[PDB]
Amino acid sequence: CQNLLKPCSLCEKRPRDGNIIHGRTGHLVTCFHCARRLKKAGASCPICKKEIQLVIKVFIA
Amino acid sequence: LNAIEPCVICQGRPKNGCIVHGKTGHLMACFTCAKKLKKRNKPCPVCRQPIQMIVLTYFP
Ligand SMILES: [Zn+2]
Ligand SMILES: [Zn+2]
Ligand SMILES: [Zn+2]
Ligand SMILES: [Zn+2]
């Protein structure tokens, strides 16, 4: 979808390649750097508020 | 970009099946097709590492 083409919703200057994972679903709205920062702050996923279990660097092929 | 092209495998759904290995993920297939790769015990088609899990990815 077209939202993947937008800069990170947080820093607005890196691509959306940070998948925030919880169970078997993930929200991809931030870059890897900001997603990790959120986990480090102990924040919940900014979309659905689930505990962030895993942060993954995503490559689109 | 590859991001606005559909699943490479079925070409009928978005690339929302994240293939997870380690701290990295390959997005090229939908959730349904990506699950099939794991079930049939295929490695990641892109980097050929084992698939740890499939994550339904929303981009919302
Ligand atoms: Zn960012
Ligand atoms: Zn979420
Ligand atoms: Zn597919
Ligand atoms: Zn891979």
CA–CA separation, B52 vs B45, rounded Å?
A: 13
CA–CA separation, B40 vs B35, rounded Å?
A: 9
Other CB atoms within a 10 A radius of the CB of residue A3 amount to: 13
The CA dihedral of A49, A2, B47, B36, to the nearest 10 degrees, is 70
Other CB atoms within a 10 A radius of the CB of residue B37 amount to: 18
- Helix extents (H) in chain B: 31-39
Q: What's the CA-to-centroid distance between B13 and ligand 3, angstroms?
A: 6
Domain boundaries, chain A: 1-61
| Secondary structure class of B29 (helix, strand, coil) | strand
Q: Are B8 and B32 in contact (CB under 8 A)?
A: no
What is A1-61's CATH superfamily? Answer: Zinc/RING finger domain, C3HC4 (zinc finger) (3.30.40.10)
Q: Name the experiment that determined this structure.
A: X-ray
Q: DSSP character for B23?
A: T
CATH class of the region B1-60: alpha beta
Q: Which residues crowd ion ligand 3, with CB under 5 Å? A: B 7, 9-10, 13, 30, 33
Residues 6+ apart with CB under 8 A from A15: A7, A8, A31
Contact A5 B4 (CB under 8 A): yes
Q: Which of residues 8-47 of B touch A (CB under 8 A)?
A: 8, 14-15, 18, 20, 23-28, 46
Q: Radius of gyration (Cα) for chain B, nearest Å?
A: 10
CA–CA separation, B60 vs B52, rounded Å?
A: 24
